[PDB]
């Protein structure tokens, strides 16, 4: 006569997410910290990109494998927000782990997120602001380009690279429907 | 090694008893079949006791 | 002990609610008394048990019980 | 000894332990840890079991029996293992503590299987197999939660046209009657054709070939081409020998020539003046389907080719290019042509359409439907308690243990629902007596409701093969009371 | 380059510095309470989703040593006055000064395509981690 | 406020009924009592569960 109540188990899968979250927690934002990662290559490299941090370290834990695959999909599509998504996945598991002892079923937890996601799209359409295609927005693009720059540097280099990055896209691409190609912009390292 | 006396006689009886107790389940049509697993991991299911003793691996002179 | 089993199981489906599981298990707990009497007497477990059920359960076209309930 | 019988139940419990939460449309995702560092996130039950490394030999027997049911039907693979796994759990104290002979339990399951099939036939409801709208909600079980959900309206017309074409009643009591006599293997075999559109996809009846014309200048429109089949191609077995082989075919003056193997350039000039197209590179497996859609007798030597061949019932010769590739359309068989915007889309529709037509035949074979969502599993357990009192024998104890395993399938959906399993199973059992087994379980909500509204129904042959294989799988594990090792 | 590339592709822009996360977490909390059209048991897990979106503004002030609870109450006080008036004013966290800020004047903006796939992307990733009841070790 | 809600969840936990379902039925009932302009007290029934 062997039958069980199916104990919660779970645990470390969320616990391992908390340890990985703290790695990218201080690495997010312009005021964050810059960490050094060197595995076997003897080459000092410092970057705050969440996708690069996971690819330069070998992780035996199966939990971080799914998180590593999420950064690869956001880079090939969105190309940004790699660290922000990691911080949202780990923090969401913390609030969901407390409800496990209460008896909340995980399927309703997954179903409850789809309901909040559909309702978020209605607020997302009203909150967003449309921007004109006119070429007079170069002054407005200066403050927007600094958003991604201030994150990866100490903010002293942003003022130098501000006119370079802004004038790089407008010079190569005239304003039409067309398309954009980042491969046409050469990169020289000295 | 050499073992004589009644010590080796009792070991031969217990050895044949352990082999006999395995085939007692296949006696008669109402009997139960058995699975023989080799080092490869495969097996077979049959109710015929003749093919069982041929595929059964037992190291013993009386076996 | 065997005759009361038919009366307990009849009230199980009559009383709604979660008590249906406890009523059915309440009659099963009385089957240990006849089982120990057969084991101590050398009789087989597969023999006495089905004979007791078939003796107290019959089809009688009438309300008044017949034959013998004293088995 | 008795230790081998315990390991058989333990091995069956270890295999079913993984698929416990894998039953039902609410099944969650599993993570399989590979020794090389890889993970498998797919929620498919039978796809994970093939990669599971097992030790006890009885665990390998459950994997082989699940593979057989996976080829016949697409679903219900985990249903058989869970149903057969819970039988050994309820019969564990009966085999050891109660000292019940194993064949008595096996014989009781054989008699219970006969009574179980009778209850399934009673709870079944009639369904029209010729209704195209009724088959939409049925096949939808294999449609929804997939990429074909948008084209499901067009997918229903493609599956029904292939099944109704190859089915033949032939009802009579003389030689025996197959119901609709469907053949999935040879006739329903699907070949993916790149290019095209899914909305405009139609069911073609005939043989299709993607090979183009082997000659630069040839007539692209032929009134009535006649298919000619041959084995040995045209070549030296030197110029007269190739022409002599053509004179045997040209004796009837055919307007079309199809060669299985390649055709040399010397034979192209001989058949050019005869007014016949040359088509090489034909597979051998498709030659059997060409003879049935044409009637040309397959002959090895060209000199033995019979004149009985006919090119009748040929739709069109049009070679017009579709998808940057020249095709050929020749439309007791059919050829399903799946057209789409890429090869990755057609590859997913392939397995989805094959599983959709397998469920489609399941309704065609048995013209009856059974309630899903644990309603069928619970309705049978109610009838088991009534027939247990009239047995009056030693088999009554193992027969009552079957009803406890029949209620595990509806309890499985409750474990994934999130509600109280004891509270729901108590009220659900009482609704089948006065409700004519119309009370099911709702997956999305989780409150016990009737199935008359949503109308969730499944064919009977799936329910019959599920309980039939489970008894055969549970009894087979009890047949082996001893396990030995060595070559 | 990839951040500016999304500006020419998509005409929609969203302000950063936690302006979208604070406004979305506050809106979703009071939206379901007024409508009550989902379920009583479902709204329990919905509250965890709203509290999980406030970690981003608390993380930016955590690295600088600022009190995450102090900057949280200052933003909520400014949003209460905006609900009474019929105008539209966005509130965001200023890391340099420590008080609130106007994201339109400061110029902090985030791409729409990046944040749209961030909510949907993190939803499926965080969900699959809770769907595995037992770790499966096999293959060797 | 959340520390005072453990008592109604503790009483129902020993009875076996889902503490999440009893919490939703009480909160939904108090909302309809305010709009009906009356005074109605609500409590947890351990036997039935509502």
Curated annotation (Swiss-Prot), chain B:
Source taxon at top rank: Eukaryota
Compartments (UniProt record): Cytoplasm
Effect of residue 31 to E: Temperature-sensitive
Quaternary structure (record): Heterooligomeric complex of about 850 to 900 kDa that forms two stacked rings, 12 to 16 nm in diameter.
Family the entry assigns: Belongs to the TCP-1 chaperonin family.
Reported function: Molecular chaperone; assists the folding of proteins upon ATP hydrolysis. Known to play a role, in vitro, in the folding of actin and tubulin. In yeast may play a role in mitotic spindle formation.
Protein name, UniProt field: T-complex protein 1 subunit alpha
Organism encoding this protein: Saccharomyces cerevisiae (strain ATCC 204508 / S288c)
Gene assigned in the entry: TCP1
Coverage span on the entire protein: 18 to 80 of 559
Curated annotation (Swiss-Prot), chain C:
Stretches that traverse the bilayer: none
Disulphide bridges, residue numbers: none
Compartments where located: Cytoplasm
Chain coiled-coil ranges: none
Similarity-based family: Belongs to the TCP-1 chaperonin family.
Subunit structure: Heterooligomeric complex of about 850 to 900 kDa that forms two stacked rings, 12 to 16 nm in diameter.
Annotated function: Molecular chaperone; assists the folding of proteins upon ATP hydrolysis. Known to play a role, in vitro, in the folding of actin and tubulin. In yeast may play a role in mitotic spindle formation.
Protein name according to UniProt: T-complex protein 1 subunit theta
Species annotation: Saccharomyces cerevisiae (strain ATCC 204508 / S288c) (Baker's yeast)
Swiss-Prot record, chain D:
GO MF entries: ATP binding; ATP hydrolysis activity; ATP-dependent protein folding chaperone; unfolded protein binding
Highest taxon in the source lineage: Eukaryota
Keywords carried by this UniProt record: Acetylation, ATP-binding, Chaperone, Cytoplasm, Disulfide bond, Nucleotide-binding, Phosphoprotein
Main location: cytoplasm
Pfam family, one: Cpn60_TCP1
Cellular component GO terms, alphabetical: chaperonin-containing T-complex
Keyword Isomerase among record annotations: no
Compartment(s): Cytoplasm
Database matches in InterPro entries: Chap_CCT_gamma, Chaperone_TCP-1, Chaperonin_TCP-1_CS, Cpn60/GroEL/TCP-1, GroEL-like_apical_dom_sf, GROEL-like_equatorial_sf, TCP-1-like_intermed_sf, TCP-1_chaperonin
Any one GO BP annotation for this protein: chaperone mediated protein folding independent of cofactor
Entry annotated with the keyword Mitochondrion: no
CDD domains: TCP1_gamma
Task performed by this protein: Molecular chaperone; assists the folding of proteins upon ATP hydrolysis. Known to play a role, in vitro, in the folding of actin and tubulin. In yeast may play a role in mitotic spindle formation.
Family recorded in the similarity comment: Belongs to the TCP-1 chaperonin family.
Subunit composition and interactions: Heterooligomeric complex of about 850 to 900 kDa that forms two stacked rings, 12 to 16 nm in diameter.
NCBIfam families: chap_CCT_gamma, thermosome_alpha, thermosome_beta
Full protein name: T-complex protein 1 subunit gamma
Lineage, top ranks: Eukaryota, Fungi, Dikarya, Ascomycota, Saccharomycotina
Swiss-Prot record, chain F:
Subcellular locations according to the entry: Cytoplasm
Recorded family membership: Belongs to the TCP-1 chaperonin family.
Role description: Molecular chaperone; assists the folding of proteins upon ATP hydrolysis. Known to play a role, in vitro, in the folding of actin and tubulin. In yeast may play a role in mitotic spindle formation.
Oligomeric and partner information: Heterooligomeric complex of about 850 to 900 kDa that forms two stacked rings, 12 to 16 nm in diameter.
Name the UniProt record assigns to this protein: T-complex protein 1 subunit zeta
Gene label: CCT6
